[PDB]
């Protein structure tokens, strides 16, 4: 009957819909590779999709995906076993090298712009009209490491202008340089900002930016990543 028709038709449409959805999520990271980077033989059931092209705003070119995938960076790792499937140990300092939970991605080395083509993230000292509206103002507070030692002082907040939120703490170190700290990775407290992921000796190791008033996408990933890696790698110096 008509309802039996309805439901087979649906289960067929549902099967094509999943196929569509499945191939749409192959647009990054494919084709699969062997651990040495050659293409894997078994690529799975579904084929790759017909490439699509995004038009990046502000004359920033296009992106076509799926496209050629190069890491565009060096990976400091060696095999630990003779067969596929095991970990790859770092061959240097994973925090410096940028592997594991400290990884970054070779993103454009330009800053994300807003709808009007201006830098999306500015240090508050250059963001006209912007102030702390609620909560504790971190500017001026000292920054503490997971080893309970003091590493620097907050000298500014870096703010998303179109989204109106704090994104980085600009921290001043003992030598006078500053670094950005991911705001998602600090605990602002009444008398200090606490950073669980870094001991104090690792604060100078945070990647630095090339212009004091702008941060680029690469820069964002390198900084962010390095801070997350300390969770795993700076654990030889952390108490409760």
């Amino acid at each position: 009957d008509l309802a039996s028709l309805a439901i087979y038709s649906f289960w067929i449409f549902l099967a094509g819909l999943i196929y569509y959805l499945q191939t749409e999520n192959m647009r990054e990271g494919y084709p699969l590779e062997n651990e040495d980077g050659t293409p894997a033989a078994n690529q799975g059931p579904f084929p790759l999709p017909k490439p699509k092209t995004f038009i990046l705003p502000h004359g920033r070119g296009t992106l076509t995906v799926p496209g050629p995938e190069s890491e565009d960076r060096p990976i400091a790792l060696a095999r630990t076993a003779v067969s596929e499937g095991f970990p790859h140990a770092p061959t240097g300092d994973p925090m410096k090298d940028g592997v594991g939970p400290a990884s970054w991605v070779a993103r454009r080395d330009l800053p994300e712009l807003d709808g009007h083509g201006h830098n999306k993230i500015k240090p508050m000292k250059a963001a006209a009209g912007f102030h702390v509206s609620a909560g504790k103002n971190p500017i001026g507070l000292p920054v503490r490491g997971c080893d309970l030692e003091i590493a620097g002082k907050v000298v500014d907040i870096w703010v998303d202008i179109p989204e109106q939120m704090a994104r980085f703490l600009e921290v001043e170190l003992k030598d006078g340089s500053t670094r950005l700290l991911p705001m998602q990775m600090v605990k602002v407290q009444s008398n200090r900002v606490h950073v669980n992921a870094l001991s104090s000796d690792l604060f100078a190791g945070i990647p630095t930016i090339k212009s004091p008033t702008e941060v680029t996408l690469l820069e964002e990933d390198k900084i962010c990543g390095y801070v997350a890696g300390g969770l795993m790698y700076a654990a030889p110096k952390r108490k409760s």
Binding site: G29, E35, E69, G98
Partner: protein
């Protein structure tokens, strides 16, 4: 085989138990100690399900059902053939669920990310445990729990529900429903908004969050933002399940009469209880 960007992440470490013993992958799947446990409780639990099917006399999956003990056994044990299999299988289901959550924590640590996902997943384990463990214990028998079968678990919902009249009138049910509905609204909106900005009118450049925020403000006068929407979705759906377990823990324990009659507390409020007219009096 590895995703094109994946090798730089398959580093040692992050395990909770076992050190570097189960620190490896099989295909795309990370194992770890709790991968092993998951597979153990899952494989063991599956065997007993097929065993239950031997005794029941059917292999049709639309008929295999594994029922809890009778109410008569209370909160004690029962024979394998008459309710004990549900007891083992239930222990295994929990084992497989909790090892799944724990294995997700291990995956999180390697990757250096937040623990939000297993935390969210733990609310669904809460709901399951309310139905098969917390509610039966308080009520005094495993019989009050639901059976493991496709269509028979649907008979439990209908029968448990209809025992208190229209279950619609459970006030926690109502709240739980609402969150379930709002989450779907918010999901369709979030899905549509991202896609509508990444996939604009043909020939145009990609839009920006600016566009997304302008679209909401133009439409309802308020835009929650891009961090707010994920805050909102995690929170909407976690509440939905929470009030589900809650509507269900109070039913048969502290409220066992019909749920429509609970609303009479409101109507008998003394300052209007005897005013004539309207629907009541």
């Amino acid at each position: 085989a590895l995703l094109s960007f994946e090798r730089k992440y398959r580093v040692p470490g992050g395990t909770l138990v076992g050190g570097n013993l189960f620190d490896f992958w099989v295909g795309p799947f990370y194992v770890g100690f709790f991968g092993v446990a998951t597979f153990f409780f899952a494989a063991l639990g599956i065997i007993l399900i097929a065993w239950s099917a031997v005794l029941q006399g059917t292999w049709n999956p639309q008929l295999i059902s594994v029922y809890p003990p009778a109410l008569e056994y209370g909160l004690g044990g029962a024979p394998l053939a008459k309710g004990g299999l549900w007891q083992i299988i239930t222990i295994c289901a929990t084992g497989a669920f909790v090892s799944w959550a724990l294995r997700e924590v291990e995956i999180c640590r390697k990757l250096g990310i937040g623990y939000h996902i297993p935390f969210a997943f733990a609310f669904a384990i809460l709901a399951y445990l309310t139905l098969v463990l917390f509610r039966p214990v308080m009520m005094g028998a495993w019989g009050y729990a639901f059976p493991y079968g496709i269509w028979t678990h649907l008979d439990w919902v209908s029968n448990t529900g209809y025992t208190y009249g229209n279950f619609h009138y459970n006030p926690a049910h109502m709240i739980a429903i609402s969150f379930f509905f709002t989450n779907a609204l918010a999901l369709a909106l979030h899905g549509a908004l991202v896609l509508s900005a990444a996939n604009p009118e043909k020939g145009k450049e990609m839009r920006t969050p600016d566009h997304e925020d302008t679209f909401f403000r133009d439409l309802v006068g308020y835009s929650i933002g891009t961090l707010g929407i994920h805050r909102l979705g995690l929170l909407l759906s976690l509440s939905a399940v929470f009030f589900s377990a809650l509507c269900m823990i109070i039913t048969g324990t502290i409220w066992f009469d019909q749920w429509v009659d609970w609303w009479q507390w409101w109507v008998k409020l003394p300052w209007w209880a005897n005013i004539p007219g309207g629907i009541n009096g």
